[PDB]
Write a protein that binds this ligand. Structure first.
Ligand code: ZN
Ligand code: ZN
Length: 374
């Protein structure tokens, strides 16, 4: 089977709060008006995900998790100009409604049309295309990438590159154009600079990964993890510090190295400490620091007004600060084009079904990124 009539399929239900994954069987309707059913091929275990499995990210339950994947279209409502079958795709966790103050503004990618602001679990009509054979499961962001078939609107879906290794191009979804993009469309990084990177996993190497893009020269990468450095220097890292080495604030052993501090820095750790700790190790005249990741489960952070006044910039961005329908694609190509490769992020490739020994290697450290193959 294939269709214009509900489908077979075994999506995985997240039956409520840090209870593993129910690798159930479900019933997805055919794509309503203006929507697009996609037959997945691959997905990643982003942590953003973990946060629902955990109370941390509030979003309605039951819900199909996953937002980081690469599909192959398979049905398309009436109204859809933008995609057509057999077409490869990247579901988009950030809309692209091509018009709302942010969509029509030159730095506005958080489309006034997402679920992040207030998770509703639905679909843009306030309705959900998924039954638990008997109960309506809710949606996630607008992807619910964790099923073998999903229904995403059109504002939330991007056509990648016809011979795009659907395997690899999944990453271009969170992990990698979030890291890499901070470095590139946000902290407008400059040729020359000294760039610091706080966190040496999946998103930071993607971030260390776009500096070098941005322009160049010095990309220190701090990780108190003697292991994350190979890979580190492996993807563009000019050097590697471990805050454990030294008997002084790292905020200091950095200001040294740059001679008053790295030009640009980035916390891809999401720690409430390391966040104040890098507004800090940047030049106070003109230095700029962007907050990448941020646990939904958090206290503010303690902080000195005084780090902003010397004249320094604190930014932040969702989805590498990139406007997405218009970008996932430029971005593949560049992968296609050669520009940047994706493997050192890919530490694990698995039969989708071990979603949970999957979400394991995630929790007990061990792996950078991992592709749950469908
Ligand atoms: Zn994510
Ligand atoms: Zn918009």
């Amino acid at each position: 089977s294939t269709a214009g009539k509900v489908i077979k399929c075994k999506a995985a239900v997240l039956w409520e709060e840090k209870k593993p994954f129910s690798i159930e069987e479900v019933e997805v309707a055919p794509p309503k008006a203006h929507e697009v059913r996609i037959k997945m091929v691959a997905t990643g275990i982003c942590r953003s995900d973990d946060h629902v499995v955990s109370g941390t990210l509030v979003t309605p339950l039951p819900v199909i998790a996953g937002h980081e994947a690469a599909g192959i279209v398979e049905s398309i409502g009436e109204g859809v100009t933008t995609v057509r079958p057999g077409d490869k795709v990247i579901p988009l966790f950030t809309p692209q409604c091509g018009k709302c103050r942010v969509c029509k503004h030159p730095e506005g990618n958080f489309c006034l049309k997402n679920d992040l602001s207030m998770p509703r679990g639905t679909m843009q009509d306030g309705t959900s295309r998924f039954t638990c054979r008997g109960k309506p499961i809710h949606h996630f962001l607008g992807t619910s990438t964790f099923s073998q078939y999903t229904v995403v609107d059109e504002i939330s879906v991007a056509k990648i590159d016809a011979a795009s290794p659907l395997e690899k191009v999944c990453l271009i979804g969170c992990g990698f154009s979030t890291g890499y993009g901070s470095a590139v469309k946000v902290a407008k990084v400059t040729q020359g600079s000294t760039c610091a990177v706080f966190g040496l996993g999946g998103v930071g190497l993607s971030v260390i990964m776009g500096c070098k893009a941005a322009g160049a020269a010095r990309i220190i990468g701090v990780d108190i993890n003697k292991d994350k450095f190979a890979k580190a220097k492996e993807v563009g890292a000019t050097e590697c510090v471990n805050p454990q080495d030294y008997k002084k604030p790292i905020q200091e052993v950095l200001t040294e190295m740059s001679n008053g501090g790295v030009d640009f820095s980035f916390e891809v750790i999401g720690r409430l400490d390391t966040m104040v700790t890098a507004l800090s190790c940047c030049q106070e005249a003109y230095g700029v620091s962007v907050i990448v990741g941020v646990p939904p489960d958090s206290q503010n952070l303690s902080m000195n007004p005084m780090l902003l006044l010397s004249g320094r910039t604190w930014k932040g961005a969702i989805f590498g600060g990139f406007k997405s329908k218009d970008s996932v694609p430029k971005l593949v190509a560049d992968f296609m084009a050669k520009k940047f490769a994706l493997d050192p992020l890919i530490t694990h490739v698995l039969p989708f079904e071990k979603i949970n020994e999957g979400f394991d290697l995630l929790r007990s450290g061990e792996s950078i990124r991992t592709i749950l193959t469908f």
